[PDB]
């Protein structure tokens, strides 16, 4: 019981954080964020309440309640986390004067330390309240369906986060990065708590809620897959049991975790002082993995000790969170002027506009094989010592720290901020060197865990078709979404030009809507595209086409987006801190007009649609349309039409 | 026979259009080229031979041999058609005067009848000399070469000779598409001119060689394939569910239909040539496609039935209705092809819609003109996709894999007048550097920046629907001496739940960004004639490197599996990658011309507006020229190293 009160605890923590803080006439991006909350929150009112009726009608209304429970949960976590970033963040300028900081990081520990309460409160709510964990045969709902308890329940509150952070983001990371294209041609100071707090950390909140909501969904499977069939009875091979703890693991392990993180911003902030915050966010990071590993790996023996090995998901946790850390560490290397994206980049501004731009281009696509290739190897480990789960409760040691992640994320921004109203500056651009980085790093981590996720949500998909008429053949029959198989080909090309083609609009909807209310009104009436082309895609192509195809579509969409986002994040992400570092000067005879200057500018504002909004995007694409396509597949694997 | 010494034909005939014109002090252009492909021939001189006998050793000499036959045939069929290039050029200046046109056309015309006759002398070399006489497409069976490959006779040596013609375009691409675009960006900033013909006509006209002899290699490889893979498994003899006779009617097909393709084609370029002449040079680019994409959805109907009349167990084959069955894949794949044209064209001109709104937006702030930019390409992307996705099923459900491959070939079964038409834009293009009258000389650059981007946009469609059955071929071709009995869908069975085809995909995915980032900062270091050249070859390796050793390393590594997924993420990466790349270096030129033609009242070449769209143009000729097309090469030629190399590595693995 102690466990299922521990999320509760983050929570007064949250609010407490906040407090001493918030002790501590630019009141003006208060009144900012309420008009886009407001208008934002009425079109959410209209659609959640909606998509509520819907999944309740079309799936098992369980799954409805739960996934309201996640809206009312993410919209709550993110409104909390916005008050702070947004007192910290007038608080920052008055830190900065005395100071030739704790207010920055604080403001941004508020929403991240919400994200972790809330979310968790919400899941801990829906794993009680919702014999789905009992019963979880293979039940076949009022229509045809054939819905797992609680799969469909958990499903269902995921597709709830998920998608109204997704909104938050195509409409904020829109009205903010359209605000700071506007600005650098006043809007934009909004723009950055908008941007890169409240639709960064709903991404954030929709990754993590995403990866466990697929743990769950495996466990609560094992036992139609495995049943025996040795002379025509069905024995369960995998016993209630183990699939009962297996399922409870991940949120045991979950609960285990943000405790960790916690720990970490308690410790920071009243923490003894430094003067340099990157080390600061780097090492907290760190410590909340060590930290994490070792307990969790008790956590992992005793709550698995004997089911018929034990801490083998432990081992599968530590492979995603080395490598979401080395992930961390690639993103850093390459948004921080310090190393090398940046720095030559920055110096070629001296060369003329253009070389800015294909640099940073360059720059971008060479820095997305690291990542990737710490998932490739990353897959492999958190798989080879574990089954399908393994990868899965990997995704979330990717992310196990995310409440440090995200404080570190909220900071830059929130930082950023800080900076921008003082115009002192030096520490106020530090700030905001810091925030582009940083939102880069939790970009990198969301990225990463998307794949990671992506891989046991997709496996689930194709195990989903285990209809009543299935129940006898083996895992491995079942288990086989087969490439050569022309449907999944075409399915696949479609599902990245899908991708391509949701970027592009969300860059022209960057465009259009920069040149408070009327691009937020603008942004939400002008939203639903991405969000249709995202969630009925699946449902679309599926009902055309079937589940080889909906299988491909998925496939080259979390291909595609795995890539793009990292392409944005960290070249995008390098372009901003490029013209910092040359605003600084740092080039010799070279500082603020000047063809260089000017070339920076040029890369920062290339960069601001791509890393604040595209990227960022394809991070929520890839996981809102795999559920989608994992719920709707229960219709159209049977109902396909050709 | 007739149909045997028809290629032959084609090349008396390149030899005939530019003799026609040529007869039509700015010579200074042939000097850069020969410098550069000095440089280069001697660097592809010591690889040539290097790789070939590589094959030889390690694979089955006669498919080194046809390699060296690939090598030969298409460093020349380039080089004609670089003499061509580099003399209508000349003569189109001078064409341009008494014009207050047939010279940039003729002489982009050379290289690409050149091309065909070339590549098919070539091919019915490697068809009678290896498919007949050393009788490959009759042993036909699965035969295990002296180390342990268990080489395919035939699939093997065209392969060899796929791999030496795709080797050697992406060289010349590599290289001297990093030298014209380098130098592009260096003139902006002369040797630019060079660089023209350079990057869109040999580079362009290679990448073209390379997609339409491999989707035909691939043809040719399934059909010497159905056979191992439809053996029955009967109460245990091995049955042949699929007869010699059968295999060999459709091994030999896409050759047939190839040899009366580029026929359609040829009419289509002395056609629209001679008439009387026309003011419009895009309307005939495109009016001489169509119609040889007419004339060849006819004749090959002809050619299909009579060729294919009565083969049996076409269905098996995948053949849904009998003997007809490739010609409507050639037709699917023609017309999705056209209309992946058309999306280029649609794309890239300004007159339409992407480059007009684009060149607008630069009275905006260059910012824009960048941000607007990508939003084209990138949505630009998916119609020619969509196109591809609706066409791989009909091309596909008409006609088993082998039908696919047919497609691929019918995308491409036009490829004259489409690299014609590609040749003329450089061609065309180098007469406005020329001049510089200039209205009339700046169409034909307009026009050099569109028909290079459709060419592109016909050979990345193509390498896609190539893709498929070169990929089919790779996981079938593990069908080591241990298969030979399960039913084919237990062996055409790439599984991608398996976390290592994941990890594949990702690793090729990621392998080809890189792969674009190399070249790219390749192009900018390398930008800032022999200097670079040198310099582009030497520090050309790594792309080859990365292109493939990578089946190689990663597979040896890994196993069939994971090359199976790299190979995967690679294809669906580079095709997104070169129709972004190429639209928007397609939209960038065009915008700039337009603004540069004034076009937007207030503005004559002058000012923000202009110098926005000269950043556009420069941001645009890395990636289009260079890294887009460059991507069109490796997932070609990453895929053909796999199918042989998986020889080894599937067995061989490391963990
Ligand atoms: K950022
Ligand atoms: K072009
Ligand atoms: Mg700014
Ligand atoms: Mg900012
Ligand atoms: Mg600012
Ligand atoms: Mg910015
Ligand atoms: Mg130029
Ligand atoms: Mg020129
Ligand atoms: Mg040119
Ligand atoms: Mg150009």
């Known amino acids: 019981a102690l466990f299922f009160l521990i999320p509760l605890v983050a929570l007064g923590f949250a609010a407490a954080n906040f407090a001493a803080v918030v002790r501590k006439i630019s009141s003006y991006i208060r009144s900012g964020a309420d008009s886009f909350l407001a208008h934002e929150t009425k079109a959410i009112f209209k659609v959640a309440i909606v998509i509520a009726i819907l999944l309740m009608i079309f799936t098992t209304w369980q799954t409805g309640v739960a996934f309201l429970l996640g809206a009312v949960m993410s919209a709550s976590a993110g409104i909390v986390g916005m008050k702070m970033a947004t007192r910290a963040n007038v608080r920052v300028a008055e830190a900065a004067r005395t100071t030739k900081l704790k207010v920055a990081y604080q403001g941004g520990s508020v929403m991240g330390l919400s994200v972790g309460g809330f979310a968790l409160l919400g899941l801990v709510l829906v794993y009680l309240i919702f014999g789905q964990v009992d019963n979880l045969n293979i039940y076949t709902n009022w229509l045809g369906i054939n819905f797992v308890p609680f799969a469909m329940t958990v499903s269902g509150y995921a597709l709830g986060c998920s998608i ?73 091979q995998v016993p209630k049991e183990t699939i009962q703890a297996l399922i409870s693991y991940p949120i045991f392990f979950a609960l285990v975790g943000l405790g960790c993180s916690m720990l970490g911003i308690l410790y920071v902030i009243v923490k003894k002082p430094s003067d340099n915050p990157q080390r600061e966010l780097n090492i907290s990071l760190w410590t909340s993995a060590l930290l994490t590993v070792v307990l969790t790996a ?32 690639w993103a850093e290397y390459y948004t921080s002027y ?89 520490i106020t651009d530090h700030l905001d060197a810091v925030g582009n980085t940083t939102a880069a790093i939790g970009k ?31 895992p491995s029959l079942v288990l086989l979404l087969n490439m050569l198989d022309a449907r999944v080909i075409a399915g696949a090309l479609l599902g990245a030009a899908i991708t391509y083609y949701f970027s592009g609009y969300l860059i022209s909807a960057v465009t259009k809507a920069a ?42 969409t979390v291909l595609s987006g795995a890539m793009l986002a990292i392409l944005t994040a960290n070249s995008g992400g390098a372009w901003d801190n ?4 040359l605003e600084a000067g740092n080039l010799e005879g070279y500082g603020k007009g000047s063809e260089p200057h000017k070339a920076l500018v040029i890369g920062d504002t290339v960069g601001d649609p791509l890393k604040d909004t595209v990227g960022p995007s394809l991070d929520i694409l890839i996981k809102i349309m795999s559920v989608v396509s994992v719920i709707a597949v229960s219709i159209f694997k049977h109902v396909h039409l050709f």
């Open 164 to 236: 109204i952070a997704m909104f938050d983001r195509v409409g904020g990371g829109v009205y903010t990065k359209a605000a700071d294209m506007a600005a650098d041609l006043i809007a934009d100071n909004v723009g950055d708590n908008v941007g890169d707090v409240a639709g960064l950390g709903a991404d954030l909140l929709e990754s993590f809620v995403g990866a466990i909501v697929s743990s769950i969904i495996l466990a609560s499977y094992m036992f139609p897959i495995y049943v025996q069939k040795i002379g025509e009875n069905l024995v369960h």
């Open 298 to 329: 008790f956590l992992t023996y005793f709550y698995l000790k004997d089911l018929q090995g034990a801490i083998s998901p432990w081992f599968s946790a530590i492979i995603g969170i080395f490598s979401g850390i080395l992930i961390g560490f």
């Open 338 to 426: 310090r190393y090398k994206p940046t720095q030559f980049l920055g110096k070629s501004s001296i060369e003329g506009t253009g070389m800015v731009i294909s640099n940073g281009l360059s720059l971008g696509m060479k820095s997305v094989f690291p990542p990737t290739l710490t998932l490739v190897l990353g897959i492999l480990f958190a798989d080879y010592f574990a089954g399908l789960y393994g990868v899965a409760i990997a995704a979330l040691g990717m992310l196990s720290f995310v409440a440090t992640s995200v404080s570190v994320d909220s900071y830059g921004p929130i930082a950023d901020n800080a900076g921008g109203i003082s115009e002192v500056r030096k």
């Open 444 to 474: 990198g981590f969301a990225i990463g865990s998307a794949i990671f996720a992506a891989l046991s949500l997709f496996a689930s998909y194709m195990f989903s078709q285990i209809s009543p008429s299935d129940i006898g053949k083996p």
């Open 515 to 556: 040149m408070i209310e009327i691009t937020s009104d603008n942004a939400l009436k002008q939203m639903g595209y991405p969000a249709f082309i995202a969630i009925l895609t699946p449902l679309v192509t599926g009902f055309l086409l079937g589940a080889e195809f909906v299988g491909g579509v998925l496939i080259g």
């Open 578 to 581: 490029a013209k910092k570092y």
